[PDB]
């Protein structure tokens, strides 16, 4: 709303809050990112270091679909188990019958190993796993089955 702005309160005061000496001018200092190496160097060096220059190698025609590999951690892995059947599984899982968690079908590429698992065997199907994620799954008596 225009009625709540300070433009309405500056009516009657000569300079409208812009100053009598400094005044409001068109573009003192330049337009946009002008002067980044000369008189706005003090700003870019302090608040945006690394702005100028090239680092690393280019990639012509980069398709981000090649690099799609969403992560799921171990502490969030049991949320892919059916919610209505999670509690019985946490009890009745064994080497003879452990739940299969198809992580690729839930939209994940790599299983990572942050957090702690239930001391319960599980069969985890993943495209990729980390060394510790698979060590923690095997320690609770589970296994990782590679898919594609």
């Amino acid at each position: 709303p225009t009625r709540l702005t300070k433009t309405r309160k500056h009516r009657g005061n000569v300079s409208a809050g812009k100053g009598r000496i400094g005044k409001h001018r068109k573009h003192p200092g330049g337009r946009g990112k002008a002067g980044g190496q000369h008189h706005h160097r003090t700003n870019l060096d302090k608040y945006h270091p690394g702005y100028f220059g090239k680092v690393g190698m280019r990639y012509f025609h980069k398709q981000q679909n090649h690099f799609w590999r969403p992560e799921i951690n171990l502490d969030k892995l049991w949320t892919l188990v059916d919610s209505e059947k999670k509690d019985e599984y946490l009890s009745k899982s064994s080497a003879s019958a452990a739940p299969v968690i198809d992580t690729l079908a839930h939209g994940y590429g790599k299983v990572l190993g942050k957090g702690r698992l239930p001391e319960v065997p599980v069969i985890v199907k993943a495209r990729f796993v980390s060394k510790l994620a698979e060590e923690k799954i095997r320690a609770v008596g589970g296994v990782v089955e590679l898919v594609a």
């Binding site: 608040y47 945006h48 270091p49 690394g50 220059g53 090239k54 680092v55």
Partner: protein, 185 residues
């Protein structure tokens, strides 16, 4: 005339009321305005002050933090007070039976507290079973995990997060972050 040793006509700098116009939040302060005014219990003066705080000053409290707070020695039946929303944590393997008093509960949090034999009550229900806050334990959420704080106090050799819209090798990584490209700060 006076030689002022301090600034004159200075507001206290603390909220004396909620900024919110929620009529039900002001009814709770009306209860705790009365309690802070009349019980001499330090618990009630803290709650009245905490009801004024803003949203960023009332971070969500996960039900896992309450689980860790209930795991203190001699704290299994203390009553947890959260002036704000209590959220769920799907990373828990288990939750105890507990009484938790909060402004709000999420669906996962309320289901999990009651599923494990606990209670999810409001702060007015607390004021009747504990008008002096006896045997309570106030839980506050993490204030510094917010994203805006990542960029607070940014500067050379300060180790904070730049305020930037895109992330990658072409975005503020060359000169001033690397000795091969001049200097590093």
């Amino acid at each position: 005339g006076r030689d002022h040793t301090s600034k004159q006509h200075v507001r206290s700098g603390h909220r004396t009321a909620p900024k919110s116009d929620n009529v039900y939040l002001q009814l709770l302060v009306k209860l705790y305005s009365f309690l802070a005014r009349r019980t001499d219990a330090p618990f009630n003066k803290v709650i009245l002050k905490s009801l004024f705080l803003s949203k960023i000053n009332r971070p969500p409290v996960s039900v896992s933090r309450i689980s860790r707070a209930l795991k203190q020695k001699g704290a299994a039946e203390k009553t947890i007070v959260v002036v704000g929303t209590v959220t769920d944590d799907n990373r828990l393997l288990e939750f105890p039976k507990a009484t938790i008093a909060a402004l709000r509960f999420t669906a996962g949090a309320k289901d999990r507290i009651l599923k494990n034999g606990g209670e999810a009550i409001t702060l007015d229900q607390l004021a009747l079973r504990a008008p002096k806050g006896q045997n309570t334990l106030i839980v506050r959420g993490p204030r510094n995990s917010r994203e805006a704080v990542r960029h607070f106090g940014f500067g050379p050799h300060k180790g904070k997060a730049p305020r930037i819209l895109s992330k990658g090798r072409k975005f503020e990584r060359a000169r001033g972050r690397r000795r091969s490209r001049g200097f590093k700060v």
